[PDB]
């Protein structure tokens, strides 16, 4: 039928019909809900490698119909010709190439349909760099450097995606092996502990195993590990003057700066797959700007990440013998004031979780008003601190899967046969 | 499939859920859309004879299985005996053992409840002989006094007669057994608890003489056998209360704040074997954030962030200062400090969530699963620094269960 979502703080009720265009399984059934599973479904739309014609063309016709609907053509001359063009193409190459207009429409709409992203109010303001002519790891490096430089924009951050050649036969994939374009190494210490970012211990070891000489610090920017057309990946060092970094200080605790903490300014997801009309872009690094809690709650305070809660609490002179003192909670707040005060002072774009979630509510309103819906994953939209004092906490959401979309994909080292 | 798997992304522990195969009723999701954040996805609708027969059977089978007597002579004769009642009376009566098992497992099956590590230690008060609202008051006073235990709180449930035709329901009209009155002022302000303004109006209309203060314990509005509800004042010496002070801020006690010790849900329906127990108030003890985050700091509730932040001398001209977050923590420190100091049972969100992970893992071990509602299990503050945040969960409905039911003033036929 049609489904209402209610906000329990304001009583606003929105009526969703967009969900009737969803195509892929969520993982839930009438009997089981998988809303907190990280990767619930394996329901693809095309399979394994090079698809047959009855597999690829129907997904292609769907996207071409959607795009031409979007611009109030549809059935027009260009639409019908574009159909016959894609059809001849799949007959002669088993794939097809998107026009520049289609590529831009698909990237933006992948962002617009990403249920887990609180930042989608900006979706239509996305700079797309077409890198489909790229042939080598060096060329991917050059494209990524220009990406990182354009996106950073001396701190006034700008949204971008750079789109390398689509998958052909599955053995010629372009990949960025780094999960984000800029991350810190994680070093396995002999005395069992971990230096740097512990999430990157494996990837940091692949880098070392590939020739990288680690400086062995707490904030070593990792090299890029770039794979072009299925070949072995290659290491490249991002010029540090393109890597904007913010030293973390606290507006009250003068001792905070003495913690020797910094973070980088540009979040840049580079291990996801962008799916458009059955085409799969296995290398599509995209970037935007941070929500402060991403750095200061998750990066800094997860137990398997930087885990700095105890040391900050120690400096704060907090009773850390029992949880009911809420010392973790108190430090957590202060760290996130620090991150926000630092980025803002160095005029690096950042948004707090209050303003960020307020904007998403406004985006939800806009999307129901003009599109009849907005897929939204509550579990990922609600921020990891102060959930209930943000408006999304009180907002019912519907989650469904629209195409074009960003998908997860296996880490290429589980997959790649070397040579 | 015969097995679904859940992973903890912080610990890498992976558990295998077989128990979801035994779930029977809807979650609200479809195969193409998830409704995991929807809060709620007829009175004459009492089960028919043929409807009730498999529900009873499934429940009795489950019960004899649990006591390792499945297929036994006593099992078969119980089944036979339940069947005869449904045939003859169009309903049946639970034995005392079954009632206790049913109510414990409704708590066990409550996917939204983080405190379920305690489910088997539940004191069950059988009140199926009650016939009038005065009798209900007597039962509920005894529940309160037993559960409160001078601050050393004990979880309990009082079960009133089950539904018959939908026209003789027993109902506690209160949502909780102890709540504070809310009063809307002519100028648009609200005195007391803004969440309780509607029910406060019902009581006053029923005759309640309101003190018009900020912490007026509301009266009980008790409905027996489908008659109009009646008012009773819980004796004030049974309502344990805690003044809220701060361990560091001298001024906090000057906010005049206090809360009650006993959380006691009274508007939910307990469903066992197809039978509906429309009045079944249960109580435990608080997790700190229920008071500290939601009761005090929701904009729709007491909304004292601004007053606390002011007395904290915080910069409130821009959100990015995180003055709200900073004030919310201290309020929650105060709530925990004050209960602990007065030796009233309370649990903080870190201990509670950690215990629930242990609980979940045990339930996977001994039961084959544990349905759980991540949207609700995760505390309303500091979510990611508590271990449940990183814990994948599967949500599904098992019976016996606790269910929502429509508010009684929306359906009652006044006499
Ligand atoms: C511009 C400001 C943006 C903000 C503040 C923002 C914020 C967020 C946050 C907080 C998450 C939660 C995931 C996590 O916490 O790890 C997320 C997820 C996501 N975002 Fe955005 N984002 C922004 C831009 C973008 C852009 C430009 C794209 C794509 C072009 C994008 C696509 C996604 C996707 C695909 C996910 C889900 C990724 C996953 O499942 O791991 N976002 N975003
Ligand atoms: C023993 C201490 C207990 C603690 C600390 C506890 C904690 C909680 C919390 C925090 C919630 C979420 C409530 C909300 O945010 O509105 C909840 C929900 C719930 N609890 Fe427990 N609880 C306890 C005992 C019990 C008992 C004894 C029962 C019944 C016998 C019970 C049944 C439920 C149910 C049915 C829900 C879901 C409420 C709903 O769906 O609206 N709980 N619990
Ligand atoms: C699996 N978990 C641990 C990942 C944690 C994580 C570590 C990182 F370094 C990192 F950059 C991210 C980006 C999320 C993100 C992406 C984007 C988009 F513009 F690209 C914008 C934004 N604001 N946030 C996430
Ligand atoms: C449906 N929701 C939105 C209502 C909000 C709400 C407001 C309140 F005042 C209140 F007390 C509760 C108690 C839940 C609860 C129940 C129990 C159990 F032992 F009874 C223990 C516990 N710790 N908590 C919930
Ligand atoms: C919209 C959303 O489902 C709703 O606000 C939920 C979110 N999670 C919750 N979790 C708990 N414990 N209590 C609640 O009232 C809610 N409310
Ligand atoms: C278990 C749960 O699915 C997992 O911890 C999720 C929960 N919500 C999240 N929300 C965001 N924004 N980011 C995350 O990584 C996660 N992780
Ligand atoms: Zn679901």
CSV table of C-alpha atoms in Angstrom, one decimal, chain B residues 44-345:
chain,number,residue,atom,x,y,z
B,44,UNK,CA,-14.7,-7.2,19.8
B,45,UNK,CA,-11.7,-8.9,18.1
B,46,UNK,CA,-11.5,-11.7,20.7
B,47,UNK,CA,-10.3,-15.0,19.3
B,48,UNK,CA,-12.8,-17.5,18.0
B,49,UNK,CA,-12.8,-21.1,19.1
B,50,UNK,CA,-10.9,-22.3,16.1
B,51,UNK,CA,-8.5,-19.4,16.3
B,52,UNK,CA,-7.7,-20.2,20.0
B,53,UNK,CA,-7.2,-23.9,19.5
B,54,UNK,CA,-3.7,-23.8,17.8
B,55,UNK,CA,-2.6,-20.9,20.0
B,56,UNK,CA,-3.3,-22.9,23.2
B,57,UNK,CA,-1.7,-26.0,21.7
B,58,UNK,CA,1.5,-24.1,20.7
B,59,UNK,CA,1.8,-22.6,24.2
B,60,UNK,CA,1.1,-25.9,26.1
B,61,UNK,CA,3.5,-27.7,23.8
B,62,UNK,CA,6.1,-25.0,24.5
B,63,UNK,CA,5.5,-25.3,28.3
B,64,UNK,CA,5.8,-29.1,28.5
B,65,UNK,CA,8.9,-28.9,26.4
B,66,UNK,CA,10.5,-26.4,28.8
B,67,UNK,CA,9.9,-28.7,31.8
B,68,UNK,CA,11.1,-31.7,29.8
B,69,UNK,CA,7.7,-33.4,29.8
B,70,UNK,CA,6.9,-33.2,26.1
B,71,UNK,CA,4.6,-36.0,24.8
B,72,UNK,CA,4.0,-37.2,28.4
B,73,UNK,CA,0.8,-38.4,29.9
B,74,UNK,CA,0.3,-35.2,31.8
B,75,UNK,CA,1.1,-33.2,28.7
B,76,UNK,CA,-1.5,-35.0,26.6
B,77,UNK,CA,-4.2,-34.8,29.3
B,78,UNK,CA,-3.6,-31.0,29.7
B,79,UNK,CA,-4.0,-30.6,25.9
B,80,UNK,CA,-7.2,-32.7,26.1
B,81,UNK,CA,-8.3,-30.6,29.1
B,82,UNK,CA,-7.6,-27.2,27.4
B,83,UNK,CA,-9.4,-28.4,24.3
B,84,UNK,CA,-12.6,-29.3,26.3
B,85,UNK,CA,-12.7,-25.8,27.9
B,86,UNK,CA,-12.4,-24.1,24.5
B,87,UNK,CA,-15.1,-26.3,23.2
B,88,UNK,CA,-17.4,-25.7,26.1
B,89,UNK,CA,-16.6,-22.2,27.3
B,90,UNK,CA,-15.0,-20.7,24.2
B,91,UNK,CA,-11.9,-19.9,26.4
B,92,UNK,CA,-9.7,-21.7,28.9
B,93,UNK,CA,-7.9,-21.1,32.2
B,94,UNK,CA,-4.2,-21.3,32.7
B,95,UNK,CA,-2.8,-23.3,35.6
B,96,UNK,CA,-0.7,-21.4,38.1
B,97,UNK,CA,2.6,-22.8,36.7
B,98,UNK,CA,1.7,-21.9,33.2
B,99,UNK,CA,0.8,-18.4,34.2
B,100,UNK,CA,4.2,-17.9,35.8
B,101,UNK,CA,6.0,-19.4,32.9
B,102,UNK,CA,4.0,-17.4,30.4
B,103,UNK,CA,4.7,-14.1,32.2
B,104,UNK,CA,8.4,-14.8,32.6
B,105,UNK,CA,8.7,-15.6,28.9
B,106,UNK,CA,6.8,-12.6,27.8
B,107,UNK,CA,9.6,-10.6,29.5
B,108,UNK,CA,12.2,-13.0,28.0
B,109,UNK,CA,10.7,-12.3,24.6
B,110,UNK,CA,10.6,-8.5,24.9
B,111,UNK,CA,12.9,-7.5,22.1
B,112,UNK,CA,13.0,-3.8,23.2
B,113,UNK,CA,14.1,-4.5,26.8
B,114,UNK,CA,17.7,-4.2,27.8
B,115,UNK,CA,17.2,-5.5,31.3
B,116,UNK,CA,16.2,-9.1,30.4
B,117,UNK,CA,19.2,-10.8,32.1
B,118,UNK,CA,16.8,-10.8,35.1
B,119,UNK,CA,13.8,-12.4,33.4
B,120,UNK,CA,13.8,-15.6,35.3
B,121,UNK,CA,13.7,-13.7,38.7
B,122,UNK,CA,10.2,-12.3,38.3
B,123,UNK,CA,7.7,-12.4,41.1
B,124,UNK,CA,4.3,-13.2,39.7
B,125,UNK,CA,1.2,-12.1,41.5
B,126,UNK,CA,-1.9,-14.0,40.4
B,127,UNK,CA,-4.9,-11.6,40.6
B,128,UNK,CA,-7.4,-13.5,38.4
B,129,UNK,CA,-9.9,-13.7,41.2
B,130,UNK,CA,-10.3,-9.9,41.3
B,131,UNK,CA,-13.7,-8.6,40.4
B,132,UNK,CA,-13.9,-4.8,41.3
B,133,UNK,CA,-11.7,-1.7,41.1
B,134,UNK,CA,-11.3,-1.6,44.9
B,135,UNK,CA,-9.9,-5.1,44.6
B,136,UNK,CA,-7.5,-4.0,41.9
B,137,UNK,CA,-6.3,-1.1,44.1
B,138,UNK,CA,-5.6,-3.6,46.9
B,139,UNK,CA,-3.6,-5.8,44.5
B,140,UNK,CA,-1.6,-2.8,43.1
B,141,UNK,CA,-0.7,-1.4,46.5
B,142,UNK,CA,0.7,-4.8,47.5
B,143,UNK,CA,2.6,-5.0,44.2
B,144,UNK,CA,4.1,-1.5,44.8
B,145,UNK,CA,5.0,-2.3,48.4
B,146,UNK,CA,6.5,-5.6,47.5
B,147,UNK,CA,8.4,-4.3,44.5
B,148,UNK,CA,9.7,-1.2,46.3
B,149,UNK,CA,11.1,-3.2,49.3
B,150,UNK,CA,12.4,0.0,50.9
B,151,UNK,CA,14.6,0.8,47.9
B,152,UNK,CA,16.0,-2.7,47.3
B,153,UNK,CA,13.8,-3.1,44.3
B,154,UNK,CA,12.3,-6.3,43.1
B,155,UNK,CA,10.7,-7.0,39.7
B,156,UNK,CA,7.1,-8.1,39.7
B,157,UNK,CA,3.9,-8.4,37.7
B,158,UNK,CA,0.3,-8.5,38.8
B,159,UNK,CA,-2.1,-10.3,36.4
B,160,UNK,CA,-5.7,-9.5,36.4
B,161,UNK,CA,-8.5,-11.5,34.8
B,162,UNK,CA,-8.0,-12.2,31.0
B,163,UNK,CA,-10.2,-10.8,28.3
B,164,UNK,CA,-13.6,-12.5,27.6
B,165,UNK,CA,-15.8,-10.8,25.1
B,166,UNK,CA,-13.9,-7.5,24.9
B,167,UNK,CA,-16.8,-5.9,26.8
B,168,UNK,CA,-15.6,-6.8,30.3
B,169,UNK,CA,-11.9,-5.9,30.2
B,170,UNK,CA,-9.8,-5.1,33.2
B,171,UNK,CA,-7.6,-2.1,32.6
B,172,UNK,CA,-5.2,0.1,34.4
B,173,UNK,CA,-5.9,3.4,32.7
B,174,UNK,CA,-2.6,4.8,33.9
B,175,UNK,CA,0.4,4.3,31.6
B,176,UNK,CA,2.7,3.8,34.6
B,177,UNK,CA,1.7,3.0,38.1
B,178,UNK,CA,3.6,6.0,39.4
B,179,UNK,CA,3.7,9.1,37.2
B,180,UNK,CA,3.6,12.8,37.9
B,181,UNK,CA,0.7,15.1,36.8
B,182,UNK,CA,1.2,17.6,34.0
B,183,UNK,CA,-0.8,20.8,33.9
B,184,UNK,CA,-1.1,23.1,30.9
B,185,UNK,CA,-1.3,26.8,31.9
B,186,UNK,CA,-3.5,29.4,30.2
B,187,UNK,CA,-0.3,31.1,28.9
B,188,UNK,CA,0.8,27.9,27.2
B,189,UNK,CA,3.4,26.9,29.8
B,190,UNK,CA,3.2,23.4,31.4
B,191,UNK,CA,3.5,22.6,35.1
B,192,UNK,CA,4.8,19.1,36.0
B,193,UNK,CA,5.2,16.4,33.4
B,194,UNK,CA,4.0,17.6,29.9
B,195,UNK,CA,3.7,13.9,28.8
B,196,UNK,CA,0.9,13.3,31.2
B,197,UNK,CA,-1.4,16.3,30.5
B,198,UNK,CA,-4.1,14.3,28.8
B,199,UNK,CA,-4.3,11.7,31.5
B,200,UNK,CA,-4.1,14.4,34.1
B,201,UNK,CA,-7.2,16.0,32.5
B,202,UNK,CA,-9.1,12.7,32.5
B,203,UNK,CA,-8.4,12.3,36.3
B,204,UNK,CA,-9.5,15.8,37.1
B,205,UNK,CA,-12.7,15.3,35.1
B,206,UNK,CA,-13.3,12.0,36.9
B,207,UNK,CA,-13.2,14.1,40.2
B,208,UNK,CA,-9.5,14.2,41.1
B,209,UNK,CA,-8.7,17.3,43.2
B,210,UNK,CA,-5.3,18.3,41.7
B,211,UNK,CA,-2.7,19.9,44.0
B,212,UNK,CA,-1.4,21.7,40.9
B,213,UNK,CA,2.3,21.2,41.8
B,214,UNK,CA,5.2,20.0,39.8
B,215,UNK,CA,5.5,16.5,41.3
B,216,UNK,CA,2.0,15.4,42.1
B,217,UNK,CA,1.8,11.6,42.0
B,218,UNK,CA,-1.2,10.9,39.9
B,219,UNK,CA,-4.1,8.7,41.2
B,220,UNK,CA,-4.9,5.3,40.0
B,221,UNK,CA,-7.7,5.0,37.4
B,222,UNK,CA,-8.8,1.4,37.6
B,223,UNK,CA,-11.3,-0.4,35.4
B,224,UNK,CA,-12.6,-3.8,36.5
B,225,UNK,CA,-14.9,-6.1,34.4
B,226,UNK,CA,-15.7,-3.5,31.8
B,227,UNK,CA,-17.2,-1.0,34.2
B,228,UNK,CA,-16.4,2.7,34.3
B,229,UNK,CA,-13.0,3.3,35.9
B,230,UNK,CA,-12.6,4.5,39.5
B,231,UNK,CA,-10.1,6.7,41.2
B,232,UNK,CA,-7.8,5.7,44.2
B,233,UNK,CA,-4.9,7.5,45.8
B,234,UNK,CA,-1.9,5.3,46.3
B,235,UNK,CA,-1.0,5.9,49.9
B,236,UNK,CA,1.9,8.4,49.9
B,237,UNK,CA,4.1,6.2,52.1
B,238,UNK,CA,4.2,3.5,49.4
B,239,UNK,CA,5.6,5.9,46.7
B,240,UNK,CA,9.4,5.9,47.2
B,241,UNK,CA,11.0,9.1,45.9
B,242,UNK,CA,14.5,10.4,45.4
B,243,UNK,CA,15.6,14.0,45.5
B,244,UNK,CA,18.0,14.7,42.7
B,245,UNK,CA,21.3,16.4,43.8
B,246,UNK,CA,24.7,16.6,42.2
B,247,UNK,CA,27.9,15.2,43.7
B,248,UNK,CA,29.9,18.3,42.6
B,249,UNK,CA,27.5,21.2,41.8
B,250,UNK,CA,26.2,22.7,45.0
B,251,UNK,CA,23.4,24.4,43.1
B,252,UNK,CA,21.8,21.3,41.5
B,253,UNK,CA,19.5,20.4,44.4
B,254,UNK,CA,18.2,23.9,44.2
B,255,UNK,CA,16.5,22.9,40.9
B,256,UNK,CA,14.0,21.2,43.3
B,257,UNK,CA,14.1,18.0,41.3
B,258,UNK,CA,13.0,14.6,42.3
B,259,UNK,CA,11.9,11.3,40.7
B,260,UNK,CA,10.2,8.2,41.8
B,261,UNK,CA,12.0,4.9,42.4
B,262,UNK,CA,9.7,2.5,40.8
B,263,UNK,CA,9.2,2.1,37.0
B,264,UNK,CA,6.0,0.2,36.5
B,265,UNK,CA,4.4,-0.2,33.1
B,266,UNK,CA,0.6,-0.6,33.3
B,267,UNK,CA,-1.0,-0.1,29.8
B,268,UNK,CA,0.4,-3.2,28.0
B,269,UNK,CA,-1.3,-6.4,27.1
B,270,UNK,CA,0.1,-9.8,28.1
B,271,UNK,CA,-0.7,-12.5,25.6
B,272,UNK,CA,-0.2,-16.2,26.7
B,273,UNK,CA,-1.5,-19.1,24.6
B,274,UNK,CA,-3.9,-16.9,22.7
B,275,UNK,CA,-5.3,-15.5,26.0
B,276,UNK,CA,-5.2,-11.7,26.5
B,277,UNK,CA,-4.5,-10.2,29.9
B,278,UNK,CA,-5.4,-6.6,29.2
B,279,UNK,CA,-4.3,-5.5,32.7
B,280,UNK,CA,-1.0,-6.8,33.9
B,281,UNK,CA,1.2,-4.0,35.4
B,282,UNK,CA,4.9,-4.9,35.9
B,283,UNK,CA,7.8,-3.2,37.5
B,284,UNK,CA,11.6,-3.4,37.8
B,285,UNK,CA,14.1,-0.7,38.5
B,286,UNK,CA,15.3,2.2,36.4
B,287,UNK,CA,18.2,2.6,34.0
B,288,UNK,CA,19.6,6.0,34.7
B,289,UNK,CA,19.0,7.5,31.2
B,290,UNK,CA,15.3,6.8,31.3
B,291,UNK,CA,15.1,9.6,33.9
B,292,UNK,CA,18.3,11.5,33.1
B,293,UNK,CA,18.0,11.7,29.3
B,294,UNK,CA,14.3,11.2,28.3
B,295,UNK,CA,12.2,12.2,31.3
B,296,UNK,CA,14.3,15.3,32.1
B,297,UNK,CA,15.7,16.4,28.7
B,298,UNK,CA,13.3,15.6,25.9
B,299,UNK,CA,11.8,18.8,24.6
B,300,UNK,CA,8.3,17.3,25.0
B,301,UNK,CA,9.1,16.4,28.6
B,302,UNK,CA,10.7,18.3,31.6
B,303,UNK,CA,13.1,20.0,29.2
B,304,UNK,CA,15.6,21.2,31.9
B,305,UNK,CA,18.6,21.3,29.7
B,306,UNK,CA,18.3,25.0,29.4
B,307,UNK,CA,18.1,25.6,33.1
B,308,UNK,CA,21.0,23.2,33.9
B,309,UNK,CA,23.1,24.6,31.0
B,310,UNK,CA,22.5,28.2,32.3
B,311,UNK,CA,23.6,27.3,35.9
B,312,UNK,CA,26.6,25.6,34.3
B,313,UNK,CA,27.4,29.0,32.6
B,314,UNK,CA,27.6,27.4,29.2
B,315,UNK,CA,27.8,29.3,25.9
B,316,UNK,CA,24.3,28.5,24.4
B,317,UNK,CA,24.5,30.8,21.4
B,318,UNK,CA,25.7,28.0,19.0
B,319,UNK,CA,25.0,24.3,19.1
B,320,UNK,CA,28.6,23.4,18.2
B,321,UNK,CA,29.6,24.3,21.7
B,322,UNK,CA,27.8,21.1,22.7
B,323,UNK,CA,26.2,22.8,25.7
B,324,UNK,CA,23.2,20.4,25.4
B,325,UNK,CA,25.5,17.4,25.4
B,326,UNK,CA,27.5,18.8,28.4
B,327,UNK,CA,24.4,19.5,30.5
B,328,UNK,CA,22.8,16.1,29.6
B,329,UNK,CA,25.8,14.3,31.1
B,330,UNK,CA,25.7,16.1,34.4
B,331,UNK,CA,22.0,15.6,34.7
B,332,UNK,CA,22.6,11.9,34.3
B,333,UNK,CA,25.4,11.9,36.8
B,334,UNK,CA,23.1,13.6,39.2
B,335,UNK,CA,20.3,11.0,38.7
B,336,UNK,CA,22.7,8.1,39.3
B,337,UNK,CA,24.4,9.8,42.3
B,338,UNK,CA,21.1,10.5,44.0
B,339,UNK,CA,19.6,7.0,43.7
B,340,UNK,CA,22.9,5.3,44.8
B,341,UNK,CA,23.2,7.7,47.7
B,342,UNK,CA,19.7,6.9,49.0
B,343,UNK,CA,20.3,3.1,48.3
B,344,UNK,CA,17.5,3.0,45.7
B,345,UNK,CA,18.2,0.4,43.0
